[PDB]
């Protein structure tokens, strides 16, 4: 038990733009907000953010609904433009 | 990142990895197991960060485990502006798709192997039985190895971090090297998800990047276990 995470209930049958509210509705939006600029900022080097535009048009047209329908209903939820979330969940594929 | 896949000597199977970032004081408080529903059952688990909506760490229950860590020949991002606009997929949102629709540890490994990617990747993958354990080393156009357990021939573990296995680790960051000793001295007799777990709490294996560790066995879904480091 101590030192595990949480643990969260995602549900495949509730739609894409709801499945993950309920998570989020754990998290302090400000903190959440904060975090995703800490890793856009020290992950995300300052030339991707200038056509970071481009990339949400690639993203919309050439990436599943899904994907893009859950990312766009966290960052209506947390207050955050759609370019930082498909970014903060483009910043990991690699270092 | 490490990961791990090994057989015991039993026939066994079982997945560990080390999930490493850089800054990561604020990951630690945004790193959540969550577990995805189907038809009112437990379809696939993982662990993942708050609004991060792929999985690089998961498994299918029954069937599969799959982590990911990430591969660099340099130019990450230009190379993935470039390689996303044709229809290619982002590497953990490949692995979060595998999981909730491959029917087997052979149909995850071909489809992990074959689609193509917006970047780079290693993904790890193990299975319920023996020898069903691959490090799939990824282009994004496809597969640049296939590297599966062959305890036939006394290679009953598989260790990848962040580096080509046929190429030596770079002396600066080899974590590659403790992890095949410490496994080495654990032998194949006593490999157990306590003594995976061991060998991901070695340094540098683990080290002050180190996020989270998860330790998993498709075999035995109700083990899989995460914990959250520092
Ligand atoms: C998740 O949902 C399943 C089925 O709906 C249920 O068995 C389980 O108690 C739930 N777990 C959590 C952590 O909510
Ligand atoms: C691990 O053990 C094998 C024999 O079991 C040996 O060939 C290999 O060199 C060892 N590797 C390390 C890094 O000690
Ligand atoms: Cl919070
Ligand atoms: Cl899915
Ligand atoms: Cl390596
Ligand atoms: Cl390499
Ligand atoms: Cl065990």
Same mark, same amino acid.
């Given at each position: 038990?101590?030192?595990?995470?949480?643990?969260?209930?995602?549900? %495949?049958?509730?739609?894409?733009?709801?499945?993950?509210?309920?998570?989020?509705?754990?998290?302090?939006?400000?903190?959440?907000?904060?975090?995703?600029?800490?890793?856009?900022?020290?992950?995300?080097?300052?030339?991707? %953010?200038?056509?970071?535009?481009?990339?949400?048009?690639?993203?919309?047209?050439?990436?599943?609904?899904?994907?893009?329908?859950?990312?766009?209903?966290?960052?209506?939820?947390?207050?955050?433009? %759609?370019?930082?979330?498909?970014?903060?969940?483009?910043?990991?594929?690699?270092? | 990142?490490?990961?791990?896949?090994?057989?015991?000597?039993?026939?066994? $199977?079982?997945?560990?990895?080390?999930?490493?970032?850089?800054?990561?004081?604020?990951?630690?408080?945004?790193?959540?197991?969550?577990?995805?529903?189907?038809?009112?059952?437990?379809?696939?688990?993982?662990?993942?960060?708050?609004?991060?909506?792929?999985?690089?760490?998961?498994?299918?229950?029954?069937?599969?485990?799959?982590?990911?860590?990430?591969?660099?020949?340099?130019?990450?991002?230009?190379?993935?502006?470039?390689?996303?606009?044709?229809?290619?997929?982002?590497?953990?949102?490949?692995?979060?798709?595998?999981?909730?629709?491959?029917?087997?540890?052979?149909?995850?490994?071909?489809?992990?192997?074959?689609?193509?990617?917006?970047?780079?990747?290693?993904? $790890?993958?193990?299975?319920?039985?023996?020898?069903?354990?691959?490090?799939?080393?990824?282009?994004?156009?496809?597969?640049?190895?296939?590297?599966?357990?062959?305890?036939?021939?006394?290679?009953?573990?598989?260790?990848?971090?962040?580096?080509?296995?046929?190429?030596?680790?770079?002396?600066?960051?080899?974590?590659?090297?403790?992890?095949?000793?410490?496994?080495?001295?654990?032998?194949?007799?006593?490999?157990?998800?306590?003594?995976?777990?061991?060998?991901?709490?070695?340094?540098?294996?683990?080290?002050?990047?180190?996020?989270?560790?998860?330790?998993?066995?498709?075999?035995?879904?109700?083990?899989?276990?995460?914990?959250?480091?520092?």
């Amino acid at each position: 038990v101590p030192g595990t995470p949480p643990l969260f209930n995602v549900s %495949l049958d509730v739609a894409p733009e709801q499945r993950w509210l309920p998570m989020l509705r754990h998290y302090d939006p400000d903190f959440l907000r904060t975090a995703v600029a800490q890793v856009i900022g020290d992950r995300v080097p300052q030339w991707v %953010l200038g056509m970071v535009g481009e990339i949400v048009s690639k993203v919309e047209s050439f990436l599943p609904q899904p994907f893009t329908d859950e990312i766009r209903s966290i960052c209506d939820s947390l207050s955050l433009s %759609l370019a930082d979330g498909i970014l903060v969940n483009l910043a990991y594929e690699a270092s | 990142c490490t990961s791990i896949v090994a057989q015991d000597s039993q026939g066994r $199977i079982y997945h560990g990895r080390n999930l490493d970032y850089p800054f990561g004081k604020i990951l630690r408080k945004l790193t959540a197991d969550v577990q995805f529903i189907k038809n009112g059952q437990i379809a696939f688990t993982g662990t993942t960060f708050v609004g991060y909506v792929g999985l690089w760490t998961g498994q299918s229950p029954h069937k599969f485990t799959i982590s990911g860590d990430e591969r660099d020949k340099g130019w990450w991002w230009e190379n993935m502006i470039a390689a996303l606009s044709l229809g290619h997929s982002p590497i953990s949102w490949l692995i979060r798709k595998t999981l909730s629709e491959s029917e087997s540890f052979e149909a995850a490994v071909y489809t992990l192997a074959k689609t193509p990617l917006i970047a780079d990747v290693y993904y $790890i993958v193990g299975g319920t039985s023996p020898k069903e354990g691959v490090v799939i080393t990824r282009d994004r156009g496809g597969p640049a190895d296939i590297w599966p357990l062959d305890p036939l021939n006394g290679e009953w573990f598989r260790v990848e971090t962040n580096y080509d296995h046929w190429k030596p680790a770079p002396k600066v960051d080899d974590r590659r090297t403790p992890a095949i000793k410490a496994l080495n001295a654990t032998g194949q007799a006593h490999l157990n998800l306590e003594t995976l777990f061991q060998v991901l709490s070695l340094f540098p294996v683990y080290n002050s990047y180190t996020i989270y560790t998860t330790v998993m066995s498709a075999a035995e879904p109700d083990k899989y276990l995460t914990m959250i480091r520092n």
